[PDB]
Structure formats: structure tokens, C-alpha cells
């Protein structure tokens, strides 16, 4: 099993087929189309991810390759020991992993990264959250004023 992927900036990395089959997008193209005489070790140029991120995704896929996929439990904070060690990176790159996880459809990787964003979201007040994500500030104060006025409570 051997498949070579090409990043957006022109770098080439060789990965295992089964480890690539972890991503649904890669396996769907490789199972419903790849049943033929392949182009000779032709690279697959994913044009939305640069060289650096593809390592981070493939690094996550290397460790999380023996996980049986089961499934519907109360949302929690398990977050296995490896992920946050992997995920201690500056703010920007973590967001880029979100796109890479969403683009290739990796449920496990998308599951973990969104947890830390929620954890960073948790324990804050609505307004203060902007100073860490720089969101816009809008719509008729009034609506807000008669929108964000249907809750708290409990």
C-alpha cells in the first residue's frame, strides 16, 4: 500500500493507503474511481492545504490508526493525552487544522480540535470572547436587546 499526496505549495509526501483511508474524502475517490490501472505513482495534489499542515494531519493519523469507529454519548472532556500535546500550537495553525479536517472530512480530527475551541469558549462571557477571536459587532442593538433577552435563566 503506497499513495503519494501533493500539498498546495508543491511538496510531496508519501503516506500509507490505509492511513489515508482514515479520511473519507481520500478513500471515496480511491475506492469508487481507483479501481483501474493507476497513473504511475501519480501524486494527488490537494490544492487547499500547504506543506506544514499536511504533516500535522498525517502526524495525527499516524497515532490514531488503531481506533475502532463505533458513538452517541453525552458530550464530555475526555480529550486523550496525545491530542492537547499535539494541539499546543499558536492560534492560527489550529484554525488551519479545522479547514484541513473539514476539507478532507476527518471526523476524529474535527471532533478533537472543536473540543479545545469549545473549551476555550467555555468559562467566558459573550462580550469578552471577541477580544480573542475578533468577531464583528452587530445588528440592531434592539434585536440583541430583545433577543439576547430570552434566556440566562437556566
Amino acid at each position: 500500500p503506497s499513495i503519494k499526496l501533493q500539498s498546495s505549495d508543491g511538496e510531496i509526501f508519501e503516506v500509507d493507503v490505509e492511513i489515508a483511508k482514515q479520511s473519507v474524502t481520500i478513500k471515496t475517490m480511491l475506492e469508487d474511481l481507483g479501481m483501474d490501472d493507476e497513473g504511475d505513482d501519480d501524486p494527488v495534489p490537494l490544492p487547499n492545504v500547504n506543506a506544514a499542515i499536511l504533516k500535522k494531519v498525517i502526524q495525527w493519523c499516524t497515532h490514531h490508526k488503531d481506533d475502532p469507529p463505533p458513538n452517541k454519548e453525552k458530550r464530555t472532556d475526555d480529550i486523550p493525552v496525545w491530542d492537547q500535546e499535539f494541539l499546543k500550537v499558536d492560534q492560527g495553525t489550529l484554525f488551519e487544522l479545522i479547514l484541513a479536517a473539514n476539507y478532507l472530512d476527518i471526523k476524529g480530527l474535527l471532533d478533537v480540535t472543536c473540543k479545545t475551541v469549545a473549551n476555550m469558549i467555555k468559562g467566558k462571557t459573550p462580550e469578552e470572547i471577541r477580544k480573542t477571536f475578533n468577531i464583528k459587532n452587530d445588528f440592531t442593538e434592539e434585536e440583541e436587546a430583545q433577543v439576547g433577552s430570552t434566556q440566562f435563566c437556566l
Binding site: 475517490m29 469508487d32 495534489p45 472530512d105
Partner: protein, 459 residues
Amino acid sequence: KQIGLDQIWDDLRAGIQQVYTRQSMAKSRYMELYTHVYNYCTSVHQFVGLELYKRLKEFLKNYLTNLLKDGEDLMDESVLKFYTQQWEDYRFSSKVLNGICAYLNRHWVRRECDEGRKGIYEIYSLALVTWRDCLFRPLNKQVTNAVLKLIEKERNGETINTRLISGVVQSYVELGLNEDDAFAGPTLTVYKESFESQFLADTERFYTRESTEFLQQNPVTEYMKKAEARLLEEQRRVQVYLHESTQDELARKCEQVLIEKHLEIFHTEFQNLLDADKNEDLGRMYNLVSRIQDGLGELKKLLETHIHNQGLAAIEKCGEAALNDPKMYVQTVLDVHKKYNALVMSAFNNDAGFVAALDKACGRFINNNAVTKMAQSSSKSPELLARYCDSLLKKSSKNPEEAELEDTLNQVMVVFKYIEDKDVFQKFYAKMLAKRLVHQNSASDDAEASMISKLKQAC
């Protein structure tokens, strides 16, 4: 932004029309046809409403209408090599279209539905909802009337070339209505109305055009052997014409068309097939009527009313010596209940109900039978039996075999059950038993002691 909305529908319709007409789509461009559709669905300038869904409905309805033009002027054996070849070039082809537009198959189609509207489907399930623009157009009248012409080659035609038909039947099953409801049992709803309803009406005729054409030129003994073949052949014309759910319903409407509506001359032939010692024809005959109910119990009285017309023939040929010759009246009836016992054993699969035929029907020629009538006594029949067992269970020249001492008594035990009046047996047995015990005119004392032990088992 960085996406746009109108630059995309100028290169997407260069591989979305190149994935169709399969021409070795390289993986190098597959992700290019994804990066477009993905970017198309992640921006605000706002998934450009729902236009991509609409534009993906027009191209499909153009490859399915410009294509109907070639094919809707074609007769049999050609529309059956057009809806089996360009079905694998649309099932396969529109399954790459289910993962090129993946981002429009996960979020918007599950959020544009489960909300405010209908007419939203997964793009794959959208392909086989617009495929009913080439099906509710020929086919439904032009292959269903053509597959039958091919399936009506049971007569002599070999090399049916199953592959073409297997494509058609599997197509109708696959075309099962996925419209609305959800993505949940089976989908055999577009199968009944197009290849089941109009396959059974056309399978009655082919069989009621050989049934009453074979029992007019050949004896019934060949319809009894063609039926087994055809009733079995129409159980192997499934499992290569398939999806099942027809085995338990094609077989029935191949069973009242062969033997449930010709159960008029079977009973008539049953009598003829009973005077003769024929024993393999009844087995096939029993097997045919075994499948059919309401009539297994009709050819049950005739056999019951044949041993009785056979029992009072052997004891009739016994003559006049039977009155003063004890063995004869026992051996004769025993022969009757040996041969017809095998009949209810080998031929009719030892049916419990059929044993009843070998039963009391045997009783009605042991109670009020001949010989007993001639020297008028219903009570006479036990006496001849009573003398017989004593006749052998006596001191004589020599008791030759220990085995014959059991089996004859065991054989005697069989005919005992049918006499319906024990009382006389106890009288006449005891009387001459007293003569036996007093004079010790018996050998192997255990054997008689075994007889009351058999009597202990009996009344």
C-alpha cells in the same frame, strides 16, 4: 470571498460532463472538481442560494433526454442491450458524482432539508429520481414486453444470456422509490408493478398452453413427470432472475396452474395406478399433491376403498377349506397387510393420515368379511385367529426355530388390533389353553408367558 459563483460553471461542466462517458478520470483532476464545489459551498457573497442543485438537475436531464433519442425507435433484443449497458454507465458514473459534490451532500441537503421544503435529495439519490425520465419513457412497456419474450424461451431456447436480464431486474429493484420518506425496509415497490405483475400473467399462459396440450396427446404418466421438472425449473429460474420475494409467490402461481386445477383426472388415474403394482409413479404423484392442500385428503378414501375391494378377494380365493384350516384365514389377511403396508410406508412417505387408510379399512374386512358371513358369526373371526396361535404354540414334531416363535406371534399381534371384539379371543384361547397346561403340550414356557406379556401390552 475568493470563490466567485459564475467562473465555476465553466470548468465544472468540463469534467462533470467528462465523468459521464467514462474515460479514465484521473485522480489528479478529481480533487480539482472537489476544490471547486467545496469553495462554491464555503463563502459569503452565501452558498449562492441553491442554484448549484438546480444546475445539476438540468445537466442530468440533458444527458437523459438527448440520450432517449437513440433507443426509443428500437425493437426487442436491442432495447435489452441498451438498458443494461447504459445503466452501468450511469450507476457507476453517477456515483463519482456522489463525492465530487460531497460538501453539497453533507451540509446543504441535510440543512436545506429537515427544515422548510421538499424536493431535496442526495445527488446520487437525485440521479435515480431523474432516471425516471428514461424509465417512465420506453422500457416500462418496451423491455417488460421484451424480457418476457426472452424469458419465454423455457421451451427449447438455450443460452438465455442471463446477464442482460439480470441487469434489468436489478435495475427495477434499484429504482425503488427513494422519493421523500427518509434514508431508511426493502425497495421492491417499482418491481411489482413492472416485472412481477406483468411476468406472472405471462407465465400462466405459457403453462396453460402446454398443460392442456400434453394431456391430450400423451398419457397422464408424463404430466406426472413434466410437472416435477417444470415446478423445479421454475425454482431455478429464480437465483439468476432475482431479488427474491418471488420464490414463495411464483411457485404457488405455478402450482395451481399445473396440478391444482387438473385434479379431475388424477383420481381417475389413481385407481388405474393402484390396480397395477406400480410403486414409483405414486411417489411422484404423492409429491405433486403433497405441495397442494385440499385434495391430499381426497386420494385417501380411494386407497381406503381399494384394499377393502382387495381384501375380500384373497379370502374369497381362499375357498371353502378356510373354515377348517386355521392357518389360511390368518396368512391370507396377513399378506394383504404386508404389501399395502409398504405402499403406505415407501410410496406415501409414511403419512400419519395415510396409515389410517391401512388402518380401519383393514378393520372392515376382518370383522364383517367373508367366511365369517358364510358360517354366520362376526365372532368367528377371532376364533380362527385363536386357533392359529395355539396351533403353532403347541407341543408338535419340533419347535424348529426360536426366532419363528417370536415373529409369528409378533405378526399375530398386528392383526389383533383390528378385530374390534376381544371377548371371543379370551374365551377360545383360554379353553384350549387349559388343555395345553394340563397336558404340558407346549414348548419354551417363556414364549406363551411372552404372549400374555404382549396381551399385557394389549387389552
